[PDB]
Amino acid sequence: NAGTELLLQSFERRFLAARTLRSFPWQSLEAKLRDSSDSELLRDILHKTVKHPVCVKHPPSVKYARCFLSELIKKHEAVHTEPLDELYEALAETLMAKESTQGHRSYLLPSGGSVTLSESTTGLVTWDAALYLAEWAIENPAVFTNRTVLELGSGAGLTGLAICKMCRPRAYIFSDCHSRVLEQLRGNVLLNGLSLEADITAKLDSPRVTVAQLDWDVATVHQLSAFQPDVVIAADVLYCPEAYYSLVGVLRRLAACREHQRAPEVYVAFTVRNPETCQLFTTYLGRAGIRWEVEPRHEQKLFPYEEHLEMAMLNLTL
Ligand SMILES: Nc1ncnc2c1ncn2[C@@H]1O[C@H](CSCC[C@H](N)C(=O)O)[C@@H](O)[C@H]1O
């Protein structure tokens, strides 16, 4: 019984997150369909995916839906041909009507809510390290509760939206330098029901959410002072070795910004796509006077990661 529930959770989370088709656990479904002639498992998969309420409100790209339903029909055809009307009617609905419009990826939260993002086809995508950092923030809510959080390179804003909906920060500052990324970020913040600080904030439960432009290369000590962060986080921001120096300079300025009172806690998570990345970043941090420790690997529970590469996260003392 436990295997079936875990399989259903896997299918739900992987379809909602629009993960790659090859990542779906088709072999466990094959075994379960071979052991039972009951199409109710396929029906439960149907209701937890294409007919899931969060999908119904924010559907993914129609291509994804039709490929998924075609492969699910193909897996249904191998076992006893008890025709399930719901699968074919749903595929009819997907195919018969509408256009591609825009895509959506949704991520479920422990509170029963969800984070819905309208990321499109490199900052316009939700990288895995964002999922990793969001999970870590969910399992360590004391770091952010009623705190001021500044994210460097928010991208689509998955991590920040998850933190705003799970850890109750006092204020959250999404920061990026690319204009289209910031536009999609504001659209995603409004899509998830969060009102910006410029707008009149209501009831003080809503965190003061701001989407500020913050280019790492020219960010001044005054501009960074203006934010007054208690925590600074970044995820998958180590794309090129040259940007290491820009990011380290930004952290340097951030510490220097408020010489009076202490420096904020800095957490940098990244996908280890090249060990040279981590080694070079650590050497630069040591040369700049920032101390660093490796945070322990946390069990990956909620979110389905795209590539399952080795994840890492550094706690930096400024
Ligand atoms: N020099 C710079 N200054 C400010 N932001 C930068 C930057 N260089 C890259 N970025 C931003 O950093 C992001 C890295 S992609 C990571 C996005 C997000 N953290 C996620 O994991 O989904 C991009 O969105 C890009 O816009």
Residue numbers in the entry: 6 to 126, 134 to 330
Show me the paper's own sentences about this structure:
FAM86A is a member of the 7βS family known to generate trimethylation on lysine 525 (K525me3) on the eukaryotic translation elongation factor 2 (EEF2). EEF2 performs the essential function of facilitating ribosomal translocation during mRNA translation. In both Saccharomyces cerevisiae and humans, FAM86A encodes an uncharacterized FAM86 domain as well as its catalytic methyltransferase (MTase) domain. Based on these data, we propose that the FAM86 domain of FAM86A confers substrate specificity by orienting EEF2-Lys525 toward the FAM86A active site.
Our initial effort in crystallizing wildtype FAM86A failed to generate diffractable crystals. To overcome this challenge, we designed a FAM86A construct harboring a triple mutation for reduction of surface entropy (see Experimental procedures), which permitted structure determination of full-length FAM86A in complex with cofactor–by-product S-adenosyl homocysteine (SAH) at 3.3-Å resolution. The crystal structure of the FAM86A–SAH complex belongs to the I422 space group, containing three complexes in one asymmetric unit. The structure of FAM86A reveals a two-lobe architecture, in which the N-terminal FAM86 domain stacks right on top of the C-terminal methyltransferase domain, creating a potential catalytic cleft commonly observed for DNA methyltransferases. The FAM86 domain is dominated by a five-helix bundle (αa, αb, αc, αe, and αf), which packs against a following two-stranded (β1 and β2) β-sheet via αa- and intervening αd-helix. The methyltransferase domain assumes a Rossmann fold, in which a seven-stranded central β-sheet is flanked by three α-helices on both sides. The predicted model bears striking resemblance to the experimental crystal structure, with root-mean-square deviation (RMSD) of 1.2 Å over 319 aligned Cα atoms. Of note, the experimental and predicted models reveal the nearly identical SAM-binding pocket with approximately 14 residues participating in the coordination of the ligand SAH Nevertheless, the experimental and predicted models show a slight difference in the helical orientations (αe and αf) in the FAM86 domain, as well as the positionings of the SAH-engaging residues W139 and Y251. Using the structural data provided by X-ray crystallography and AlphaFold, we determined the FAM86 domain of FAM86A forms a five-helix bundle distinct from the 7βS domain. By testing the catalytic activity of a truncated FAM86A construct lacking the FAM86 domain, we found the FAM86 domain is required for EEF2 methylation in vitro and in human cells.
